[PDB]
Amino acid sequence: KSQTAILPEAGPFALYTLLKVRQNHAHVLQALKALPALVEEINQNQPGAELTVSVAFSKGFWSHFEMASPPELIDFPELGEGETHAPSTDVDVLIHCHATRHDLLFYTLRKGISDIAQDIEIVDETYGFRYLDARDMTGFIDGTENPKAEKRAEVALVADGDFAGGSYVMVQRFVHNLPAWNRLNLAAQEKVIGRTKPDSVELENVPAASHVGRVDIKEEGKGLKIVRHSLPYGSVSGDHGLLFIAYCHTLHNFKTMLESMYGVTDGKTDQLLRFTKAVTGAYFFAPSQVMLQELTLK
């Protein structure tokens, strides 16, 4: 059994919290374990909320656990240079929630960490929201080729072993340059993305440097697929863009797409990265519900 946030389709609103554990590690772990029980209680008090949660830990923080770390779990490596850079964030824990209402997300975080506020530093706290008809602020629909129904389970979740039901996670908070992106016309923007803007139909000739051209990778030969839970975020006068987050049964897919996007593989960078920049970056592993409740410090 995976954690409730991973498999279902993303709700209209989402919470993505990155935090660092400074002290009282045992108290913090307990508080994190008690999140599912809190969420269940909220759902019982609030029909239609469909509140979900997934707690994940970084490679560095996993050392504190008695349970052995996932085979592929590593630190998020920095990629690229200058205007095409993928920063690495010092973070121990990811808290991911999504629901049909925004307020319960704030409540879940406030109530959930109330006792461990002084033990924790929240590195980043992003509230995502569905934008129009599932569109990114770039005007293009996001999630068109995102796995659906049954194949979500076999793409996101580890199939076998001790970590079965668990999932590898990546997150990158992107900040958009909307005016620069606005300069390009419809056809040009479609060349950057690789799909049509109004109906998200894949172009007959997908440019290799286009975003889809960068991330549509098959090497098996079978497509490297991930389950994305990303959602637009931010304000007009401040940071705004996309909180990218994805789950996968293997971290290899993340690494391949990122190395392809940031010019490690081909030497060519993603055209989309001309109009957006990653400000955070981290790898995690979200264990099954059982393992999460069985995790203990050493």
Residues that bind its own copies (CB under 8 A): 13, 102-104, 106-107, 109-110, 113-114, 117, 122, 125, 127, 129-132, 137, 178-179, 232, 234-238, 240
Give the range of 46-54, 89-97, 253-261, 283-291 binding ligand HEM by CB under 6 A: 253-261
Residue 4 or 172 having the CB closest to ligand HEM: 172
Q: Which of 257, 282, 291, 292 binds ligand HEM (CB under 6 A)?
A: 257
Of 172 and 271, the one with the shorter C-beta distance to ligand HEM is: 172
Q: Which of 69, 84, 196, 200 binds ligand HEM (CB under 6 A)?
A: 200
Residue 132 binding: pick among its own copies, ligand HEM, none (C-beta 5-8 Å cut-off by kind):
its own copies
Alpha carbon distance 170, 151 (integer Å) = 19
Distance CA 156, CA 201 (A): 24
Contact by Cβ (8 Å): 158, 164: yes
Q: Crossing angle, helix 25-33 and helix 35-45, to 10 degrees?
A: 30
Q: Which is nearer to its own copies, 105 or 224 (by Cβ)?
A: 105
- Largest Cα span, the chain: 57
Other C-beta atoms within 10 Å of 86: how many? 22
Q: How far is the CB of 79 from ligand HEM (least distance, A)?
A: 10
Q: Please say which residue, 175 or 217, places its beta carbon nearer to its own copies.
A: 175
200 touches, from ligand HEM, its own copies, none (C-beta below 5 to 8 Å by class) = ligand HEM
User: Which token pair is 92?
Assistant: 């121990």
Q: Which is nearer to its own copies, 58 or 126 (CB)?
A: 126
| Contacts with 112 (C-beta within 8 Å, 6 or more apart), sequence order | 31, 34, 35, 38, 95
Binding at 16: pick from ligand HEM, its own copies, none (beta carbon under 5-8 Å per type): none
Output the 3-class SS for 92-151. Answer: CEEEEEEECCCHHHHHHHHHHCHHHCCCEEEEEEEEEECCCCCECCCCCECCCCCCCCHH
d(CA 211, CA 272): 6
- Active site annotation includes 266: no
Q: Which of ligand HEM, its own copies, none does residue 114 bind (CB under 5 to 8 Å by kind)?
A: its own copies
Q: Which of 92, 136, 142, 270 is catalytic?
A: 142
Contact (CB, 8 A) for 194 and 213: yes
Q: Catalytic residue positions?
A: 142
List of residues contacting ligand HEM (CB under 6 A): 136, 138, 140-146, 172, 174, 193, 195, 200, 211-212, 215-216, 226, 241-242, 244, 254, 257-258, 261, 272, 276
